[PDB]
């Protein structure tokens, strides 16, 4: 259920984020900033339009979209992508494509926590957020 995602979530743990960002082109200077940072993800719905915002001292982004309906997105790291977000049995699956490249962001609730798995080819990163 989408509804179970809604609310504000605060990053508490991060695993292999640096390699994920490097895998995407994020430069060293910026990786150092982003990694010590502890972002908030806010997930909202308004009818059948979801909005996911990322709030932090590094960057601030927001996306709004319908599930299964493809959309343009400019990412935190300034990639210009084609995105699609679907719901695969409680798992929010965010697929991005740009320049023949693909990355996936999977969001699932485990133990009252929101676990985001980021995958870019072989670079995999897991980021755990606590409900606020
Ligand atoms: O986290 S995400 O927006 O998912 C994100 C996803 C994919 C690539 C990212 C690259 C740099 C920073 C991010 N965000 C970020 C925002 C605030 C603090 C630290 C990193 C990236």
Author numbering: 0 to 131
What does the paper say about this structure?
We solved the crystal structure of hFABP3 in complex with ANS at 2.15 Å resolution. The crystal contains four identical hFABP3 molecules in an asymmetric unit. The same densities have been found within all four molecules in the asymmetric unit, indicating that the bound ANS molecules adopted an identical conformation. An important feature is that ANS is located in the middle part of the binding cavity lined with a cluster of hydrophobic side-chains. The structure clarified four water molecules in the binding cavity of hFABP3, and through these water molecules the bound ANS molecule forms a hydrogen-bonding network with the side-chains of Thr40, Thr53, Arg106, Arg126 and Tyr128. In addition to van der Waals interactions, these indirect interactions should contribute to ANS recognition. Indeed, the sulfonate group of ANS is positioned far away from Arg126 (6.4 Å) and Tyr128 (6.5 Å) so that their direct interaction is highly unlikely in the hFABP3–ANS complex. Therefore, to compensate for this distance, these water molecules are located at similar positions as those of the FA carboxylate group, resulting in interactions with the side-chains of the Arg and Tyr residues. Furthermore, our analysis revealed that the orientation of ANS binding to hFABP3 is opposite to that of ANS binding to mFABP4. The structural comparison of hFABP3 and mFABP4 suggested that one of the causes is the effect of steric hindrance between the side-chain of Leu115 and the aniline ring of ANS, arising from the replacement of Val115 of mFABP4 by Leu115 of hFABP3.
